[PDB]
Amino acid sequence: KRPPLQEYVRKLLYKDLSKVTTEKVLRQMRKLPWQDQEVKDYVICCMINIWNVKYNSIHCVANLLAGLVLYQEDVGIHVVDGVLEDIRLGMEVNQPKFNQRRISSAKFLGELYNYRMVESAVIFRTLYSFTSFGVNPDGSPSSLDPPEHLFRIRLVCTILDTCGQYFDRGSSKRKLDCFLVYFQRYVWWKKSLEVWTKDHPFPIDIDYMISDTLELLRPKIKLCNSLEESIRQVQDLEREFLIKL
Amino acid sequence: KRPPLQEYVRKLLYKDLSKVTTEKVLRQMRKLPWQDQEVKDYVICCMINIWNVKYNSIHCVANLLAGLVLYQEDVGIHVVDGVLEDIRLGMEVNQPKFNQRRISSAKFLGELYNYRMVESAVIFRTLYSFTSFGVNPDGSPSSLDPPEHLFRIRLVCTILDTCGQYFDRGSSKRKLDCFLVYFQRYVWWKKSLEVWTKDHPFPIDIDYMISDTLELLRPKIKLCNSLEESIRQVQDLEREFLIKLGLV
Amino acid sequence: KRPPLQEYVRKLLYKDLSKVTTEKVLRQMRKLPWQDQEVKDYVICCMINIWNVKYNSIHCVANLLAGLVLYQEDVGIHVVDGVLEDIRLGMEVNQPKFNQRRISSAKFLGELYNYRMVESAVIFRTLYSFTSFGVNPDGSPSSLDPPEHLFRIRLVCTILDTCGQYFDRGSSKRKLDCFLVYFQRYVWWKKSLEVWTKDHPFPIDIDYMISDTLELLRPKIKLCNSLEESIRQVQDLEREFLIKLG
Amino acid sequence: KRPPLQEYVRKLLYKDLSKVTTEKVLRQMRKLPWQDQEVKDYVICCMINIWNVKYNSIHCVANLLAGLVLYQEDVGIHVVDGVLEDIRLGMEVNQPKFNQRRISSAKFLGELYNYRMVESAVIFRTLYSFTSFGVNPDGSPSSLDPPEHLFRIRLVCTILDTCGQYFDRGSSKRKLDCFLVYFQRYVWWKKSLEVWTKDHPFPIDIDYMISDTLELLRPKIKLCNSLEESIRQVQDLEREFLIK
Amino acid sequence: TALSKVVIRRLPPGLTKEQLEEQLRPLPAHDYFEFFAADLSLYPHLYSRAYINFRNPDDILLFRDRFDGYIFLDSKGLEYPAVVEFAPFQKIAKKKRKKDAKTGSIEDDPEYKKFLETYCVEE
Amino acid sequence: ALSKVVIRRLPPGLTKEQLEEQLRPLPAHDYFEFFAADLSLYPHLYSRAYINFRNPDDILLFRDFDGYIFLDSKGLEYPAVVEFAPFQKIAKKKDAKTGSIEDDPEYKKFLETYCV
Amino acid sequence: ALSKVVIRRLPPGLTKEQLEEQLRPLPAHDYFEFFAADLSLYPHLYSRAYINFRNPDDILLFRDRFDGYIFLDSKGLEYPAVVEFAPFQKIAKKKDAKTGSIEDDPEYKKFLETYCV
Amino acid sequence: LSKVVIRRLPPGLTKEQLEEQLRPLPAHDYFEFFAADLSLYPHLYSRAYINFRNPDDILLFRDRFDGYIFLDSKGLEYPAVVEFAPFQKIAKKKKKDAKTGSIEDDPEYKKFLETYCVE
Ligand SMILES: [Cl-]
């Protein structure tokens, strides 16, 4: 029902990449008619829609892209912009039918950093957008972050699980420490909502997910036990920045 | 800081209204200057703001109003209109800080039926509003009913536990059984959303509170085990519509 | 019935210290047995309890300590930590019977900067604490900052009147500009409270105090005339701060 | 005699605003108290009264407004509405003492289209109103269009000489080609009047203005040399429209 | 019978009955017309409303079509699209028993008086 | 197809509240602005108003105020004109500099130029 | 010194030409690309474009001009555009010999044996 | 930052009881202790200051002691406070002052004792 070339590039990206070697598929893809803008626009869409790939095989797509741009420069910038675009659009529409689609995109963005396609500045800008875009600054729920919506946390942990272990030396070391403190406050904003009672406690899977990611990144750091401690940590962090010029 | 009249009314309704002081307080309330438009309006506000009363003392104010209307016929209408207004506004505003405020309101409406302040049509008209207002007909989530938002379930179960036990004879029995068919579909619309996974399941507390109320109402209830089964129940019920409406 | 040596120290600091006799007092304190830990502690506490000295002679104690550290290197650190502690404890306790005492401690912390005993960071770190410690981020009244409690403003102004004149060059100037942006929002949280009505208005004496110190420090600053104007100015600041963070 | 803030905006608009000082006037105009309805009211009136500006510097006011609406979008709407009001009211009043005042207003409307403040439709509806409003269809003179009154021609050419060169590609091409037919007939309605004698001929100055303007827009056409021709071209135009 | 009580809700809080009566004038025949102000307890969400009971249960079609969605404006100018639907409680105050004898006699009560003694000392 | 209508050639000494009374009951509308007379043409002073109706199908009735005789306090006919506004755009919704001219060095230099 | 700006949440039916005309005059640029909607998110289609300005000071006017500018689709629905700094600021900076030869490949040819009947 | 303050302790704890209660104790070149001054009648608390060699033992030290409830002799609970001291300067090694301990042999002190002898 679909053209044969289109089905072939899909067979390479969504099937052959988790089975064979990335080089076998890379040269196969270099031989595609890249001068034809029709097929080029199609393969880019296939890579952006990485939700069709097995979650554990997504790094193969980043590895492949890192090499394919040595021969098709513009495809690299187009997929990255698309991935970052779908991460934004996913937050705006915020529909449950796109949750697995959005988790993969976040994972893909993390693997694109591991293979040096984007730099930490892009990853930290995306990390903050998860805890700030559509978020009322007073901590009140809003349309884009309703009270019982915890998907922002699952996105932050998805990215931190894939490339946060490399933010432990030099500049990126403390930029991650600074994002975490703002993330712990966002966490406690949600925990402090009235919807969480004794019979309806905070989802325990989210608590385990947060403690696990923090345990890996910073083993010696302990999540706060109150909202006041989190509001202090941010107040102390930004206060010291205001004092150091 | 407050007028003495107003604070006295607040002590009567929120502090002095025990289970056996109802009559004592009613006679204290008959003495109020009801010809004054200001204090009357204020007293009605106090009764609508029922969240200031302890949950298990809410039936007391309903009992109070049932007797107070024998001498002030108009105050009965004004309180119910405000309670039904606040229930709807709660759904339109839908902020967590008003949840206890809205649970108490749903309780009040249930008690007002027990003391013959409203008829069963009011209670059912409101129950359907919990499952239809702001709800998309396809089951998809919306702004007034986000996916993980299950407060409508707790409001429906708050009313059914308060007065649903009186819907088991004659017309009032079938009118409830038809609602529960629609209620079960709304429940299964929530269960079948993508947010609920194996690690983040449908809150068992909600499952528990649903089963407890239906067991309390219809012990033989045929609990739908799927979304399709609840949809069939609705489709079969709508067949009954069009024979009793005259189109099939 | 006070021991002889102790009363002599109290006479030196609270009575004999009158601006001009400072060198004579310093040499008299150098002769004290500093290696006796008990006597050292009492002397340090005497300087921390600065409320026993006349307000306009408080700077004298700071000058004395500036010369005393040329011979007892540890006492300079001990007094500052004691004063900063007394400031924080004053906020925690928050009882009006200690108000005049807490105003003296702020003056002393201000004078300690004028005599190069504390760095610029300690002053602004203490200033911010006045506007944040025990303060809810939404501007709502709290246990340590009730509605009619405006002592925090009086403390901010006592320090800015003592050493804000020297925050006019380079980085120190920029630090003060940022703090004032936060300080004005705190003021407007207090004004917007429910307790201030037409019959119970915001004390005009506090308004006059605020405008005076601000006009003395920055004569060209535009005062915020609304709680919205204050919240906008703060968001504009932290908007520029996050770009340099990451 | 006038408050200082009012005299300042007059200095920015009627003196300081030359071709090169627009950048400094904009930022200076953004700081005015736009929340005060009285100041903003007066500002709009100052711009509508474009006759106080040097004719050749009028385009600067349009450029100023084009950027001033990126921060006060409401003000551009009222300035245009006021300009169109004064064009219409100028025709209804029609006194020679307001001629250069109305000439400046017509110029302003043209420049407002150049900096994309009004669409082509607003320009053509005004162009036709000059040749129709207050004009009797049978061609005879009327109260608002006496015989020797040729100010409508002076107005039409004022607008076409400032933005008509931009009407030669696509839709706006046909729209203008059709207005020139009705304009040619109006011109000939005025030429065919009995007031023009040998010693008192049709103003040669105005006819040169018609030839010069039409030369700049469409070099492919010269004005009709007869009234019947202009009537024939209108009849042809309307017939071909009805058949297609 | 058929429904006859109509509610006009989600109106601006600063709207008075006279202001509403002018915007609605001339409203059809009605035995009931009451106006109710805002509550203030839900401080961010103030809305006034009105109730009208029509004599003819068919003029509602025209009335609903004229005002269901009608935009009201406050001082600041914010829009308040009104909601005009059947009131969820169709009963109204009916003119009727004998007046109550104790109405307005609380000031001459010992329990109240005692309360005033205790409330006189406050703060 | 259009929705913005102009009510022009009104009396100059007319206010908006008075007009809203004469127009009562107006059809629904998003836009209703009133503009007094300009004072630059003393002999020819006319106020006007603009309305943007929500339903573009009720203008035919409102048009059929076209010719409505408005009167001033001194007594004189001001037959209002109701037509489709020649410009059919209305603005519908902040700058940081708004209201900063008072604390400005060029306007302060101007005050030195104009006050003395 | 950021120079790449994105115009997103445009109507899906819009193409590059009517965009360039709407934004006419395009400030000078060495990069100007336009991207259509994904189509797999059926209810939420939005096209977007990227512009890399040569002078990163002309975007202050550009951002204030078109950030929020209401675009219109066929039926006439309002698509308020969004003009921000592109979240990824890199742009396209011999030729390959294999390009355009996949049809003459054994792996692709054998796949056709599987895909066609 | 390396200096840490231990405050809101019991007024009766002396330094070695603190040093005992705070065992194990990471590396620290600075360890000052301050009792409570009698003056402020109702609110008497002792405190301590510690400058850690490697600024990272505070992460482990704070969580171990921040909130540690101490007890007074009479049986009163004292939730401790652990945070970075607001004044981050410490003492360093140095010649001594010749006058130290000479006040007893001074005329001005002598004549004061005379006036103080007759209470
Ligand atoms: Cl105070």
Residue numbers in the entry:
A (entry chain D): 767 to 1011
B (entry chain B): 767 to 1014
C (entry chain F): 767 to 1012
D (entry chain H): 767 to 1010
E (entry chain A): 65 to 160, 162 to 188
F (entry chain G): 66 to 129, 131 to 159, 164 to 186
G (entry chain C): 66 to 158, 163 to 186
H (entry chain E): 67 to 160, 163 to 187
Quote what the paper states about this structure:
UPF3 is a key nonsense-mediated mRNA decay (NMD) factor required for mRNA surveillance and eukaryotic gene expression regulation. UPF3 exists as two paralogs (A and B) which are differentially expressed depending on cell type and developmental stage and believed to regulate NMD activity based on cellular requirements. Here, we show that UPF3A and UPF3B share structural and functional homology to paraspeckle proteins comprising an RNA-recognition motif-like domain (RRM-L), a NONA/paraspeckle-like domain (NOPS-L), and extended α-helical domain. Here, we report two crystal structures of the RRM-L and N-terminal region of the middle-domain of UPF3B and UPF3A bound to the MIF4GIII domain of UPF2.
To further analyze UPF3A’s higher affinity to UPF2-MIF4GIII, we crystallized UPF3A-58–206-Iso1 with UPF2-MIF4GIII. Resulting crystals diffracted to a resolution of 2.95 Å and were phased using the UPF3B-41–189 + UPF2-MIF4GIII structure. As expected, the architecture of UPF3A and UPF3B is highly conserved as well as the interface between UPF3A and UPF2-MIF4GIII. Surprisingly, UPF3A-58–206-Iso1 had an affinity of 220 pM for UPF2-MIF4GIII, binding 16-fold tighter than UPF3B-41–189. One such region is a 6-residue hairpin of the RRM-L between β2 and β3 of UPF3B and UPF3A (N85 and T87 changed to A102 and L104 in UPF3A) where a shift in the register occurs. In UPF3A, the register shift spanning residues 102–109 (85–92 in UPF3B) (compare left and right panels) alters the positions of side chains of both UPF2 and UPF3A. The side chain of residue D103 (D86 of UPF3B which is not involved in binding) binds the pocket and forms a polar contact with the side chain of N815. In the NOPS-L α-helical region of the UPF3A structure, the terminal end is better resolved relative to the UPF3B structure. UPF3A E187 could form an additional polar interaction with the backbone of UPF2′s K767, likely stabilizing the terminal end of the NOPS-L binding interface. In summary, UPF3A binds with ∼10-fold higher affinity than UPF3B, mainly relying on an additional interaction between the NOPS-L and UPF2-MIF4GIII domains, and to a lesser extent on a structural rearrangement in the β2-β3 hairpin of the RRM-L domains.
